[PDB]
Design a protein around this ligand. Sequence first.
Ligand SMILES: *[C@@H]1O[C@H](CO[C@@H]2O[C@@H](C)[C@@H](O)[C@@H](O)[C@@H]2O)[C@@H](O[C@@H]2O[C@H](CO)[C@@H](O[C@@H]3O[C@H](CO[C@H]4O[C@H](CO)[C@@H](O)[C@H](O)[C@@H]4O[C@@H]4O[C@H](CO)[C@@H](O)[C@H](O)[C@H]4NC(C)=O)[C@@H](O)[C@H](O[C@H]4O[C@H](CO)[C@@H](O)[C@H](O)[C@@H]4O[C@@H]4O[C@H](CO)[C@@H](O)[C@H](O)[C@H]4NC(C)=O)[C@@H]3O)[C@H](O)[C@H]2NC(C)=O)[C@H](O)[C@H]1NC(C)=O
Ligand SMILES: *[C@@H]1O[C@H](CO[C@@H]2O[C@@H](C)[C@@H](O)[C@@H](O)[C@@H]2O)[C@@H](O[C@@H]2O[C@H](CO)[C@@H](O[C@@H]3O[C@H](CO[C@H]4O[C@H](CO)[C@@H](O)[C@H](O)[C@@H]4O[C@@H]4O[C@H](CO)[C@@H](O)[C@H](O)[C@H]4NC(C)=O)[C@@H](O)[C@H](O[C@H]4O[C@H](CO)[C@@H](O)[C@H](O)[C@@H]4O[C@@H]4O[C@H](CO)[C@@H](O)[C@H](O)[C@H]4NC(C)=O)[C@@H]3O)[C@H](O)[C@H]2NC(C)=O)[C@H](O)[C@H]1NC(C)=O
Lengths: 208, 208
Amino acid sequence: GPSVFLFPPKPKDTLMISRTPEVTCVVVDVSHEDPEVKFNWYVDGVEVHNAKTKPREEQYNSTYRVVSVLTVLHQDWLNGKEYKCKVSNKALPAPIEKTISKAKGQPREPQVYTLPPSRDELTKNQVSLTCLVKGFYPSDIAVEWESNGQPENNYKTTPPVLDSDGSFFLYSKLTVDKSRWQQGNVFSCSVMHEALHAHYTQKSLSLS
Amino acid sequence: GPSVFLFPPKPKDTLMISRTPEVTCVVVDVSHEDPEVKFNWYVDGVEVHNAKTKPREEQYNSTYRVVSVLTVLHQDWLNGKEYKCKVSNKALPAPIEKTISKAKGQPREPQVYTLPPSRDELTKNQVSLTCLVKGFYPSDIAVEWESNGQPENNYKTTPPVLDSDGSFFLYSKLTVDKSRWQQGNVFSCSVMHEALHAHYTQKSLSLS
Ligand SMILES: *[C@@H]1O[C@H](CO[C@@H]2O[C@@H](C)[C@@H](O)[C@@H](O)[C@@H]2O)[C@@H](O[C@@H]2O[C@H](CO)[C@@H](O[C@@H]3O[C@H](CO[C@H]4O[C@H](CO)[C@@H](O)[C@H](O)[C@@H]4O[C@@H]4O[C@H](CO)[C@@H](O)[C@H](O)[C@H]4NC(C)=O)[C@@H](O)[C@H](O[C@H]4O[C@H](CO)[C@@H](O)[C@H](O)[C@@H]4O[C@@H]4O[C@H](CO)[C@@H](O)[C@H](O)[C@H]4NC(C)=O)[C@@H]3O)[C@H](O)[C@H]2NC(C)=O)[C@H](O)[C@H]1NC(C)=O
Ligand SMILES: *[C@@H]1O[C@H](CO[C@@H]2O[C@@H](C)[C@@H](O)[C@@H](O)[C@@H]2O)[C@@H](O[C@@H]2O[C@H](CO)[C@@H](O[C@@H]3O[C@H](CO[C@H]4O[C@H](CO)[C@@H](O)[C@H](O)[C@@H]4O[C@@H]4O[C@H](CO)[C@@H](O)[C@H](O)[C@H]4NC(C)=O)[C@@H](O)[C@H](O[C@H]4O[C@H](CO)[C@@H](O)[C@H](O)[C@@H]4O[C@@H]4O[C@H](CO)[C@@H](O)[C@H](O)[C@H]4NC(C)=O)[C@@H]3O)[C@H](O)[C@H]2NC(C)=O)[C@H](O)[C@H]1NC(C)=O
């Protein structure tokens, strides 16, 4: 019947002390027949009571969806604590358990390189600015572009890819009008990751 | 009872005339009580009988696994014809129908750009050669590297990523010994895609 999906905090939230990371427990296919759901949360086995469950709400299919959110401490998530969400419902003979933690494995520092557009690309009115981020472990990561403190609209980032040494890599393509590039504007790829010092680094790229 | 799996040809196979693309119809779980299986092939609903089907091989889970291979015409697959493999078994109330055809959508031509390693990366013994392939549709594509006409296989390629204008892009990373890069060896990124002229193009990258 009702299924449960447990989601981790956003990388950004866990890596910036100013932000609040939370684990999210989503119960779907809750039926009108038995629409009561109780959540029990556990951090490394020990129960906790600061979860806020949202009021259940109807779906376009006539099931109910119901979500419980548990704020987590940056250090706890980064230190590898296990978060367990226990879901009990009258239609469930025995509760459903999902437990989640950060990716296991030795953390590896990302190397961040910026690559300008190929010469060939200057025959267009738009050009490709490239951020190559490689050698990192946990795949969990945030990569963003900006120019003079302002975030850039047109960019897309590949999913992380398992490289041969077992680290991950990825690329982010930033698209700007050629004039912006030829004007000598400075663009910046920002990267946030746990094995980075102060969880953050940025590399610049402009026309020299 | 018996299950049927229909497999598309490899992009690279459909794309190079000197290669042989084929659609593969795998039937698993055929009982020893109802072993006789017959294949009927239909291109755009028109039956064909040039399928080489291998004699049934016995597994370890008591069932057999028969394979039928249809060598398809390059042009055919690429013109979007529909390959219907119809397997008959006596343990079936009705003969299963599995059909397949190449992805639909307006074909778009990939732009291919080679990008040398950031200067920052020359502090390493290994460097990263980057191929940017963008603006293609069908996300079906083959990307490969070589040097001196010989394949260079220490590379990893990202999945196609849906870009903001509806087409796909990707990146291929080729890792070589810095010493090879600085002796000025020429590496080449070969792309194969249906929307390319002659279904092939290549860009080279060497020390500048
Ligand atoms: C009635 O409707 C509801 C609402 O659904 C909505 O219906 C209409 C309107 C359509 O628009 C739907 O697309 C729309 O969602 C239905 O509820 C849905 O139920 C399905 C399953 O039936 C769920 O699918 C799961 O999706 C998760 C990931 O979901 C995230 O991303 C989705 C899109 O990518 C997004 O839609 C979700 O909102 C969710 O988004 C995340 O949410 C959190 C919290 O807000 C947020 O922090 C994130 O930022 C956000 N992220 C993203 C990407 O947006 C997917 O992971 C599930 O896959 C698991 O299960 C599969 C088998 O069941 C299996 O193939 C996968 O491998 C995986 O299995 C797990 O695997 C791991 C390891 O691999 C293992 O450890 C686990 O044990 C294992 N779990 C198993 C096997 O159970 C899965 O595909 C939808 O999320 C859900 N939609 C919503 C919005 O709630 C409902 O089904 C409908 N009722 C009926 C009967 O049809
Ligand atoms: C008895 O044994 C046989 C085989 O023996 C085997 O060997 C023993 C010793 C064990 O080690 C076992 O490995 C195994 O028992 C069993 O037969 C198997 O049956 C399973 C299903 O139970 C099949 O799984 C399917 O796999 C396909 C993809 O298959 C390719 O990749 C596999 C790895 O993923 C690989 O193992 C296969 O060999 C195969 O390899 C490809 O072969 C082609 C042929 O030329 C070649 O071109 C390719 O290059 C090559 N690829 C490689 C090597 O990379 C997978 O696609 C199927 O997934 C679909 O179906 C699933 C349900 O089964 C479903 O969960 C998925 O979502 C997916 O569903 C699809 O959904 C979409 C959307 O609707 C739709 O487009 C699809 O049509 C739909 N498919 C549906 C609905 O059918 C699937 O998982 C195995 O291939 C098969 N093994 C072999 C080798 O034939 C048998 O089950 C055993 N009987 C028992 C248990 O009693």
